[PDB]
Scaffold this active site. Structure first.
Site, PDB file in Angstrom:
ATOM      1  N   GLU A 186      45.033  43.613  45.125  1.00  0.00           N
ATOM      2  CA  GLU A 186      44.747  43.010  43.814  1.00  0.00           C
ATOM      3  C   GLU A 186      45.927  42.244  43.305  1.00  0.00           C
ATOM      4  OE1 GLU A 186      42.112  42.534  42.371  1.00  0.00           O
ATOM      5  OE2 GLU A 186      40.666  43.953  43.306  1.00  0.00           O
ATOM      6  N   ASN A 212      40.387  33.255  34.824  1.00  0.00           N
ATOM      7  CA  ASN A 212      39.137  32.827  35.491  1.00  0.00           C
ATOM      8  C   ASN A 212      38.477  31.691  34.688  1.00  0.00           C
ATOM      9  OD1 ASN A 212      39.165  34.902  37.528  1.00  0.00           O
ATOM     10  ND2 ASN A 212      38.819  36.307  35.823  1.00  0.00           N
ATOM     11  N   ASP A 228      35.306  31.602  33.885  1.00  0.00           N
ATOM     12  CA  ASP A 228      34.287  32.156  32.994  1.00  0.00           C
ATOM     13  C   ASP A 228      34.794  32.606  31.637  1.00  0.00           C
ATOM     14  OD1 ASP A 228      35.568  34.572  33.597  1.00  0.00           O
ATOM     15  OD2 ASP A 228      33.685  35.657  33.921  1.00  0.00           O
ATOM     16  N   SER A 239      37.182  34.790  31.175  1.00  0.00           N
ATOM     17  CA  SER A 239      37.818  36.113  31.329  1.00  0.00           C
ATOM     18  C   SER A 239      39.095  36.025  32.100  1.00  0.00           C
ATOM     19  CB  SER A 239      36.864  37.079  31.978  1.00  0.00           C
ATOM     20  OG  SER A 239      36.783  36.862  33.384  1.00  0.00           O
ATOM     21  N   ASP A 252      41.885  38.623  34.560  1.00  0.00           N
ATOM     22  CA  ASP A 252      42.153  39.869  35.271  1.00  0.00           C
ATOM     23  C   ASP A 252      43.623  40.180  35.027  1.00  0.00           C
ATOM     24  OD1 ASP A 252      39.622  39.500  36.493  1.00  0.00           O
ATOM     25  OD2 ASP A 252      40.579  38.286  38.067  1.00  0.00           O
ATOM     26  N   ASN A 286      39.501  43.409  34.380  1.00  0.00           N
ATOM     27  CA  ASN A 286      38.951  42.210  33.805  1.00  0.00           C
ATOM     28  C   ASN A 286      38.625  42.396  32.293  1.00  0.00           C
ATOM     29  OD1 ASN A 286      36.074  40.473  33.310  1.00  0.00           O
ATOM     30  ND2 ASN A 286      37.608  39.410  34.503  1.00  0.00           N
ATOM     31  N   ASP A 340      32.470  55.288  34.343  1.00  0.00           N
ATOM     32  CA  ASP A 340      31.364  54.501  33.821  1.00  0.00           C
ATOM     33  C   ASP A 340      30.432  53.991  34.945  1.00  0.00           C
ATOM     34  OD1 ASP A 340      31.640  54.902  31.149  1.00  0.00           O
ATOM     35  OD2 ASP A 340      32.384  52.853  30.705  1.00  0.00           O
TER      36      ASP A 340
END
Ligand code: NA
Ligand code: NA
Ligand SMILES: [Pt+2]
Ligand SMILES: [Pt+2]
Ligand SMILES: [Pt+2]
Length: 128
Positions: free
Chosen positions: A35, A46, A48, A50, A52, A59, A101
């Site tokens: 990562e 990113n 979109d 967002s 990271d 994210n 989650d």
């Protein structure tokens, strides 16, 4: 901070990741390597909207709040800047929330693609 593999293994183990939900320590170290290259300050912004953040590239849509991402859930209840700290506690706690989650480690693409099915113990081999 850019961690060494063995230093990161020991820090992860102090925070309970060895065998967390059936994922051995090497899995976690391997995920961080691919990562972020063990860099606590890594960011990937990113298209979109967002980003990271940090050593585990968590994210900002679902997991942490950076204030600028559409669709924010903030499920780890933390600002994303906390995930850029030089100590790993907030990242580790959020990573445990992600798995809690309903996610496996498949939630991290670099785990799936670079660690899944491999000799992950190499990443802790030779370490105290
Ligand atoms: Na992180
Ligand atoms: Na969020
Ligand atoms: Pt600690
Ligand atoms: Pt902890
Ligand atoms: Pt700690």
């Amino acid at each position: 901070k850019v961690f060494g593999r063995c230093e990161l293994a020991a820090a992860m183990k102090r925070h309970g990741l060895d065998n967390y939900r059936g994922y051995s320590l090497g899995n976690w170290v391997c995920a961080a390597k691919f990562e972020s290259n063990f860099n606590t300050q890594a960011t990937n912004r990113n298209t979109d909207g967002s980003t990271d953040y940090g050593i585990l590239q968590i994210n900002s849509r679902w997991w942490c709040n950076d204030g600028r991402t559409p669709g924010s859930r903030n499920l780890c209840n933390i600002p994303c800047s906390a995930l850029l700290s030089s100590d790993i506690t907030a990242s580790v706690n959020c990573a445990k929330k992600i798995v809690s989650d309903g996610n496996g480690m498949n939630a991290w693409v670099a785990w799936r693609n670079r660690c899944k099915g491999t000799d992950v113990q190499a990443w802790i081999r030779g370490c105290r």
